[PDB]
Each structure stands twice: as C-alpha cells, then as structure tokens.
C-alpha cells in the first residue's frame, strides 16, 4: 500500500522557520514527481511546491517563492519542505502528494499542521451551563459547557469521560482577540438529570491543563 | 494564473439523487483537470484525472466530463458516504490551482430548533466577563437568524456564533450564540433574551430570563 507520512508541523511565530518531512513507502519513490499541497483553515487547497523524480527541478508559486525550498533524498525515501520567513497566511495543513505522469495528486498523506501566530499560549476557563434557575422542567433537559479563552487549538471536550456521547453537539471554536472559545451541549431525558451525574471534561494539551466541571442545578438560593 | 471557479459552493440533495458540480477555467486547459473528494477529517483523494479518467478503485457512479473551459463532475446516485466535499484542480500550467470546493448536504424534513438559554455561571461571574449562551439545536434547513435583546434592546456587540456541520445521525444543524459582556454591564440589566427566526415558524422562538430571579 502506498504510504506518505508527514511530520515536522507545529506552532511558529511570524518570521520563523520550520522544516517538514514526508516519509514515503510502498512504492518506488525515486520514480515519482512529488508536491506539497496545503489546506488553509478556510478549507482552500493551495499547491505549495513541486519537485521532479530525480530532484534536479523544482517549481513554486509566487506566494512562497524565495521563502520555501522543496527537496528530496531518494536514498532515504523522504521529501522535505524548508519553510522560512513564515507568515500568518502560511497557516495550513501541509500534505505530501505523489503525482502521476502530470501533476494530478494520486496519493496524499494525512497531513502535518503548521500554525503561524504570535498569540500567547492561554489555558481556558471552563464554565458549567445549567438550565435557568427555577425553570419549569420538560421531558428533556439541555446542559452545556463553555470553554472560554484559549490558545492554540485544540481542546478535547467529553461528557462523563466519553461515556455520554448520544445527544451531544460540540460547536466549532471561534477566534476573537487571539483567543478561541468553544461550547458543547448535551441533551438528556429530565429523569436522568440531576438524579444522575453529568460532568464536562476539558483538556488543553498546549497548557497541560485538564478540568472537570460537574453540571449542578442553579440555586437553591 | 488560471482561476478555477467551482459551483455551487454547496448543494442539498436526497439520497439516490443525481447531482452535477461544475468547474470553469479562466482560460482553455484541454482535459488537464482532476477532481478530488474530501471526507471530514481526512486528506483529499483523487477521483478523476485528465477530465474523464477514473482513478483506481473509484466507483463508476462518479464521472467527469468536459474539455476547454467548462468541466462537470457527476454523481449518478448519491450514497450516504458521498455527502462530503469535492474539488477541481488544473495541472495545465504552474501555478497549479484548485477550485474553491463544493459541499454536498443531505435533505430531510423541516425541523424547528430547540432553543435553550443559559445565564452566566456563578464561576464566570468571578471574572471581568459574563457570557450568556443560547443553543439552537437540531433544526433543518440550515439557515437561521438569532437576535439578542437586553432589557428589550437589540444587542449586536459582543455576540459570536458557531454552527455545527450537518449531523451524521439525524441530518440536522445546530448553532451556539454567545453574548459576552463585562460583569459590570451584565449586572446593570435585568432581562436577557435570545430570539430564533427559522422558516418553520412565522413567529420567532423566544427564550428569556431575568437576572437574580429564580
Ligand atoms: Cl530529475
């Protein structure tokens, strides 16, 4: 099976440098032209660079020309992308792709994420969202969890350590003033809460933070 | 550079329906075009190359046509797994360029949102801020409007919205709206209201609470 595995992604300040690698296996690497193709946060696909099978010829769009260098080591079955003078608009998932006889992209790796930002790492506040105080309760109840003010992405959010997965919606994070905010809702039958425990579990790997917030009813005063 | 204009940006269809996506090149490129699929959380995969040739292992319900500037990609009978994104790409000339993509979504019966409002948590009210959250859950179709009012006054400043992708289980959409104020401003007002406008009713769904009432 053709296999392409990218590595080297990370969070870098504007003006910084990063070198990506792509380990190729399951085909004769030296026989194929290769490209890097990136996908921006807006899900736009952008070709970044191409290199010939033998490594002698390279091609770039003007967007990265003079900043990025594609190279390959045929003996090591590896493709590289040296990135320099990084800009916010270079933020993307970077994929390694094997070309056909022409530059269609027949096989793609899983991608390595590059984030170019000066924003400071910030742990979120995690807030339990219980229904309005003294609200008349219907047949179902909806609870929430607000994860406010973190950087970078991602967080992981579960309910009851992942045991509560039905009736859950976790909303995509929104970015404001260099901080993300996310929320999650969970809907259960009213006979299950608050008689049974519901807890939001949030981890933010970049800040090594993990918090559990049990949803408790508002009140009694 | 060759601009690839892909249409539509999104389209809703039923299971079993035939759909056609178009890609327009800004100059003639013969048959030097490819089409890709991308499933959520996965890398793009080649479906069609050289305008009409199916990649190895691709089902024959996928096809491509065209030469010159106007290209078509067709799915003859949509299967559940096909409601994802598709992109065209030219390889006629560097720089290689992609269309903007098309997302296919599944149709279902109209459903009104279930609306829930959440006052700031007691824990948050220890910060400089106070967030009021409104969930508009499990509605169809995707278009919806939310309005916030504070003491009857429409509030735009400090509102941020987030929308889920179509639910894989029930084909509905959900939306979260968060109004963030300073704690001081929160405590200056009494009534907080989230109003949802959706095609399922001529009247908005209104959820409200009064601060420090139980
Ligand atoms: Cl070469």
Residue B116 has phi, psi (to 5 degrees) of -130, 135
Per the CB < 8 Å rule, is B135 touching A106? no
Whether residue A98 is found in the same domain as residue A139: no
Any chain B CB within 8 A of the CB of A181?
A: yes
Query: What does the alpha-carbon distance between residue B92 and residue B3 come to, in Å, rounded to a whole number?
Result: 12
Domains and CATH numbers, chain B: 1-108 (no CATH), 109-214 (2.60.40.10)
Among the partner-chain residues A39, A132, A170, the one whose CB lies closest to the CB of B209 is A132
Of A118, A147, A182, the domain-final residue: A118
Locate breaks in chain A with C to N over 2.5 A; list the residue preceding each.
none
Per the CB < 8 Å rule, is A103 touching B87? no
**Residue B102 in tokens:** 């098309």
One-character DSSP codes across A152-217: SS--EEEEGGGT--TTEEEPPPEEETTEEEEEEEEEEETTTTTTS--EEEEEEGGGTEEEEEE---
Query: What does the alpha-carbon distance between residue A65 and residue B185 come to, in Å, rounded to a whole number?
Result: 50
Q: What is the CATH number of the domain that holds A136?
A: 2.60.40.10
Q: Which of residues 38-57 of B touch A (CB under 8 A)?
A: 43-46, 49-50, 55
Using DSSP's 3-state secondary structure scheme, residue B32 falls into: coil
Whether residue A48 is found in the same domain as residue A90: yes
Whether residue A105 is found in the same domain as residue A124: no
Whether residue A139 is found in the same domain as residue A197: yes
- CB-CB neighbours of B6 under 10 Å: 21
- On the CB side of B121, CA atoms within 13 Å amount to 22
Contact between A125 and A148 (Cβ < 8 Å): yes
Per the CB < 8 Å rule, is B162 touching A130? no
Mention every residue, 6+ apart, whose C-beta is less than 8 A from residue B64: B33, B35, B47, B48, B51, B52, B53, B71, B72, B73, B74
- CB-CB neighbours of A17 under 10 Å: 12
Among the partner-chain residues A47, A131, A185, the one whose CB lies closest to the CB of B137 is A185
Whether residue A132 is found in the same domain as residue A100: no
Smallest CA–CA separation between B112 and chain A, in Å?
A: 16
Whether residue A75 is found in the same domain as residue A137: no
Of A87, A103, A118, the domain-final residue: A118
Among the partner-chain residues A105, A146, A169, the one whose CB lies closest to the CB of B164 is A169
Per the CB < 8 Å rule, is B55 touching A106? yes
**Residue B84 in tokens:** 């994802």
Whether residue A98 is found in the same domain as residue A132: no
Query: What does the alpha-carbon distance between residue A45 and residue A83 come to, in Å, rounded to a whole number?
Result: 18
Of A118, A143, A164, the domain-final residue: A118
Maximal CA-CA distance, chain B: 70
Contact between A217 and A197 (Cβ < 8 Å): no
Q: Indicate which of A1, A32, A127 best probes the interface with B, i.e. most B CBs within 10 Å of its own CB.
A: A127
Per the CB < 8 Å rule, is B214 touching A127? no
Q: Compute the 3-state secondary structure of chain A and give helix, strand, coil in percent, each to the nearest 5.
A: 5, 50, 45
Contact between A11 and A152 (Cβ < 8 Å): yes
Whether residue A105 is found in the same domain as residue A198: no
Which H/E stretch holds residue B180? strand B173-182
Q: Which of residues 128-167 of A touch B (CB under 8 A)?
A: 128-134, 142, 144, 146, 148
- Structure-derived torsion over alpha carbons of residues A187, A192, A194, A199, reported in degrees to the nearest 10: -60
> Which residue in B7, B105, B92 sits closest to B50, CA to CA?
B92
Smallest CA–CA separation between A184 and chain B, in Å?
A: 9
Query: What does the alpha-carbon distance between residue B9 and residue A207 come to, in Å, rounded to a whole number?
Result: 37
Q: How far is CA A140 from the centre of its chain?
A: 33
Query: What is the strand order of the sheet B19-25 is part of?
Result: B4-7, B19-25, B70-75, B62-66
What is the DSSP pairing of strand B159-163 with strand A45-51?
unpaired
Any chain B CB within 8 A of the CB of A124?
A: no
Among the partner-chain residues B32, B98, B131, the one whose CB lies closest to the CB of A146 is B131
Q: Indicate which of A26, A33, A68, A104 best probes the interface with B, i.e. most B CBs within 10 Å of its own CB.
A: A104
Contact between B45 and B36 (Cβ < 8 Å): yes
Contact between A155 and A184 (Cβ < 8 Å): no
Contact between B63 and B71 (Cβ < 8 Å): no
> How would you class B155 by CB atoms within 10 Å of its CB: exposed for 0-12, middle for 13-18, buried for 19 or more?
middle
Resolution in A: 1.5
Among the partner-chain residues B55, B137, B213, the one whose CB lies closest to the CB of A187 is B137
> Which residue in B76, B73, B55, B56 sits closest to B64, CA to CA?
B73
- Taking CB atoms and an 8 Å cutoff, what residues of chain A touch B117? 132
Whether residue A112 is found in the same domain as residue A141: no
Whether residue A180 is found in the same domain as residue A88: no
Paired with A107 in beta bridges are A98
Whether residue A144 is found in the same domain as residue A191: yes
What is the Cα Rg of chain A in Å? 23
Any chain B CB within 8 A of the CB of A193?
A: no
What is the domain range of residue A179? Answer: 119-221
Whether residue A31 is found in the same domain as residue A61: yes
Which H/E stretch holds residue B186? helix B183-186
CA angle A97, B23, B66 (to 5 degrees): 95
Question: Structural domain tally of chain A?
Answer: 2
């Amino acid at each position: 099976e053709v296999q392409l595995v990218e590595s080297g992604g990370g969070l870098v300040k504007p003006g910084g440098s990063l070198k990506l690698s792509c380990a190729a296996s399951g085909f004769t690497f030296s026989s194929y032209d290769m490209s890097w193709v990136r996908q921006t946060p807006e899900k736009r696909l952008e070709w970044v660079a191409m290199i010939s099978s033998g490594g002698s010829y390279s091609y770039y769009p003007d967007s990265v020309k003079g900043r990025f260098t594609i190279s390959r080591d045929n003996a090591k079955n590896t493709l590289y992308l040296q990135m320099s003078s990084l800009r916010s608009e270079d933020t993307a998932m970077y994929y390694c792709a094997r070309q056909g006889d022409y530059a269609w992209f027949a096989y793609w790796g899983q991608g390595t994420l590059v984030t170019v930002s000066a924003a400071s790492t910030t742990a979120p506040s995690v807030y339990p969202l219980a229904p309005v105080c003294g609200d008349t309760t219907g047949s179902s109840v909806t609870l929430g969890c607000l994860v406010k003010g973190y950087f970078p992405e991602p967080v992981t959010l579960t309910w009851n350590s992942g045991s509560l997965s039905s009736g859950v919606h976790t909303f995509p994070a929104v970015l404001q003033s260099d901080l993300y905010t996310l929320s999650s809702s969970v809907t259960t039958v009213s006979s299950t809460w608050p008689s049974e425990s519901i807890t939001c579990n949030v981890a933010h790997p970049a800040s090594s933070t993990k918090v559990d917030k049990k949803i408790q009813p508002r009140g009694p005063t | 550079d060759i601009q690839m204009t892909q249409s539509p940006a999104s389209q809703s269809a039923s299971l079993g329906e035939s759909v056609t996506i178009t890609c327009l090149a800004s100059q003639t490129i013969g048959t030097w075009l490819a089409w890709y699929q991308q499933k959520p959380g996965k890398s793009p995969q080649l479906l069609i190359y050289a305008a009409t040739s199916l990649a190895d292992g691709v089902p024959s319900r996928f096809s491509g046509s065209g030469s010159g500037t106007k290209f078509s990609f067709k799915i003859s009978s949509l299967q559940a797994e096909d409601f994802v994104s598709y992109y065209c790409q030219q390889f006629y000339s560097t720089p290689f360029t992609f269309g903007g993509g098309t997302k296919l979504e599944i149709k279902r019966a109209d459903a009104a949102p279930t609306v829930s409002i959440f006052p700031p948590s007691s824990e948050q009210l220890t910060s400089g801020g106070a967030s009021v959250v409104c969930f508009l859950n499990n509605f169809y179709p995707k278009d919806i409007n939310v309005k916030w009012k504070i003491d009857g006054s429409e509030r735009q400043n400090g509102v941020l919205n987030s929308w889920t992708d179509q639910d894989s289980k029930d084909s509905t959409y959900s939306m979260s709206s968060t109004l963030t104020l300073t704690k001081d401003e929160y405590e200056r007002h009494n009534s907080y209201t989230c109003e949802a406008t959706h095609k399922t009713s001529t009247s908005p769904i209104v959820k409200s609470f009064n601060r420090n009432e139980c």
